[PDB]
Every structure is written in structure tokens, then in C-alpha cells.
Amino acid sequence: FSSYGHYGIHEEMLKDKIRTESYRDFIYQNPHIFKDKVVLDVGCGTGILSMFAAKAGAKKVLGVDQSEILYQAMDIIRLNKLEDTITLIKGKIEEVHLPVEKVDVIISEWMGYFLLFESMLDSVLYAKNKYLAKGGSVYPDICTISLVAVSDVNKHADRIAFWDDVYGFKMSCMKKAVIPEAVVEVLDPKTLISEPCGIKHIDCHTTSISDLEFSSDFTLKITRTSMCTAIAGYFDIYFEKNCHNRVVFSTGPQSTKTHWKQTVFLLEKPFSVKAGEALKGKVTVHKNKKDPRSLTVTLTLNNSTQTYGLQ
Numbered sequence: 001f002s003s004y005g006h007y008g009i010h011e012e013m014l015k016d017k018i019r020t021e022s023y024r025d026f027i028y029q030n031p032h033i034f035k036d037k038v039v040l041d042v043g044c045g046t047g048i049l050s051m052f053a054a055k056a057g058a059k060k061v062l063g064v065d066q067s068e069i070l071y072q073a074m075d076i077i078r079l080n081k082l083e084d085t086i087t088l089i090k091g092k093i094e095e096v097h098l099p100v101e102k103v104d105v106i107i108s109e110w111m112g113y114f115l116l117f118e119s120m121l122d123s124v125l126y127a128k129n130k131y132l133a134k135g136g137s138v139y140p141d142i143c144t145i146s147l148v149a150v151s152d153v154n155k156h157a158d159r160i161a162f163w164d165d166v167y168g169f170k171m172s173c174m175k176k177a178v179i180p181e182a183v184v185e186v187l188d189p190k191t192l193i194s195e196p197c198g199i200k201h202i203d204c205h206t207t208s209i210s211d212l213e214f215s216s217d218f219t220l221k222i223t224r225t226s227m228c229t230a231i232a233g234y235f236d237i238y239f240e241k242n243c244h245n246r247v248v249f250s251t252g253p254q255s256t257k258t259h260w261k262q263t264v265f266l267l268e269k270p271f272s273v274k275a276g277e278a279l280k281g282k283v284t285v286h287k288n289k290k291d292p293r294s295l296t297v298t299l300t301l302n303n304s305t306q307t308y309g310l311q
């Protein structure tokens with residue numbers, strides 16, 4: 001997270017209005033969760049979430065960040081005259097000393113592409129287990145991951161078939177290098193050819209890092225006779241617990257784009273499909289053993305298995 005030291009990443013998250021306004025509406029519409037409480041903001045970045053908490057009436061907010069962005073947060077917090085409520089702490093949540101032993105509320109923007117990329121939920125779960133007061137709460141509290149079948153033969157060809165004739169030379173062996181790299185892009189919802197299928201439900205209050213390594217059967221109900229060229233992944237985020245004004249956002253292709261877009265696993269061998277059909281398959285999501293921040297996602301479908309990496 002040298003990357004998180006740069007303004008660009010933060011600028012992009014703050015320009016993600018669906019994302020930021022969701023956390024804002026949650027905090028502002030449910031002040032009772034925050035009023036007079038002690039709040040921990042895991043990975044506070046510019047301090048945006050910590051300031052939302054302060055405005056909703058938090059007694060004390062600890063903004064923790066490992067990146068150099070923390071120093072901007074310090075200045076930002078002072079600029080807004082919030083330094084008597086929000087403390088900034090520089091370091092990894094799993095190793096910094098905090099000046100308190102328990103907190104009432106943990107808030108965090110931890111989600112990666114396909115929800116789990118970067119493995120920042122591990123860090124939030126660490127904070128939850130070590131610092132959340134008995135009876136306390138962690139937000140967002142519920143998360144889900146869905147898959148949807150895609151048909152886009154022309155896009156498939158632009159990316160894959162590119163390699164067949166490059167300035168007069170065959171480079172078709174490159175296709176074997178292309179297929180395994182999951183693509184992060186916004187999908188044209190016109191190209192969706194199934195109903196979605198949930199593949200994971202996460203309760204952030206009771207889940208363990210162990211549960212974030214998972215298999216799931218899935219069935220996609222095809223809505224359009226055509227050819228399946230890819231499977232897409234996405235996630236929904238819920239703010240529910242203790243909320244009278246409950247907040248949800250989706251990062252699916254049917255919803256307003258976010259900076260997470262969608263994660264797309266291209267099929268090595270696309271295959272036909274009929275409206276009404278129940279397309280059956282299996283997905284496995286594991287940390288990349290060499291780099292636990294990277295994901296490995298294995299799709300079995302139409303009698304073939306393929307492992308994909310998210311960077």
C-alpha cells in the first residue's frame with residue numbers, strides 16, 4: 001500500500017458517489033449508532049469516514065492507516081476542526097498500539113474487486129476480534145457475491161482473437177496467457193444472458209478468515225438463447241444491524257457503475273445455451289498461496305475447469 005499513499009486512488013474512491021454516499025447515508029441516517037460512542041475506522045485514508053462519524057456525534061474516533069495518506073488525514077481533520085474528536089494513528093491495524101482497549105463501532109471501507117481481492121477483510125476481522133466491545137458492531141455488516149453469465153462474442157474476439165494475426169505473425173499461444181487473467185471492467189447489461197446466482201453470503205459479525213476460502217455450486221437460469229463467452233462476478237454491500245434507515249449498494253452490471261466495476265472470467269471455450277435452461281457449475285475462491293492479497297478463482301462449467309487470477 002505504497003499505492004494508497006497517492007492521491008489518485010483516494011480521489012477515485014471519493015469520486016465513487018455510490019460508494020461514498022452509501023457510507024455517508026448509513027452514518028448520517030443512523031446517528032444513534034455513533035452518538036457518544038467510540039469508533040474505530042480501519043484504513044481511514046483521507047479520514048472521510050472518521051469525519052462522518054464525528055459529525056454524527058461520536059465521542060472519540062480512531063482513524064488508523066498504514067499508508068502515508070495518514071499524514072494528509074491529520075491535516076484534513078484539523079482543517080475541519082475535528083481534532084478534539086478524531087485521533088489519527090499511523091500503522092497496520094494488526095500491529096499498532098491503540099490508546100483504547102475496546103471500541104463500540106468499527107467502520108471500514110475494505111472491499112476489493114470481486115469483494116475479496118487485496119484481502120483487507122482479514123484486517124477488519126482482526127480489529128473486530130481484538131477491539132470490538134462485547135455487544136459492539138462492525139460496518140458494513142452483511143456482504144454477498146454473485147455470478148452472472150455473459151454473452152459478448154465480439155468483445156471476446158477483440159481481446160482473444162487479437163493474437164491470431166499480429167502484423168502478419170501468429171501469436172495464438174498468447175491466448176493461454178490471456179484467459180487466466182480476470183478482467184475488471186464495466187459490463188453492458190445488454191450482454192447479460194442469465195439471472196444472477198449468489199455464491200457467498202458473509203456476516204461480518206460472525207465470519208472468520210477461514211470462511212473467506214470457499215466453494216459454491218451455482219446455477220444460472222439462462223434468459224436468452226445465445227453463446228456464453230464469460231462469467232462475471234460482483235458483490236452487494238448491506239448496512240443493517242441496529243439501523244432504522246438500512247442502506248444497500250450493488251456493484252452489479254444492472255446498477256450504477258462503481259469503481260469496482262465487475263470482475264469478468266473469460267471462457268477458454270465459449271458454449272451455447274437456451275432460454276429457460278438451468279446452467280450448472282462450481283466456483284472455488286482461495287487466496288493465492290504466494291501472495292495472500294491475490295485471489296485464485298476456479299470455475300467448473302460445461303465440463304471444463306479453469307483457474308483465474310485477480311492480479
Ligand SMILES: Nc1ncnc2c1ncn2[C@@H]1O[C@H](CSCC[C@H](N)C(=O)O)[C@@H](O)[C@H]1O
Pocket residue numbers: 001004005013014042043044045046047048049064065066067069091092093094108109110120123
Ligand atoms: N492492515 C491495514 N492497517 C491499516 N491500514 C490499512 C490496512 N490495510 C489497508 N489499509 C489502508 O486502508 C485504506 C483503504 S481505502 C479506504 C480509504 C477511506 N477509509 C475511504 O473510505 O475513503 C488505504 O488507505 C490503505 O492504506
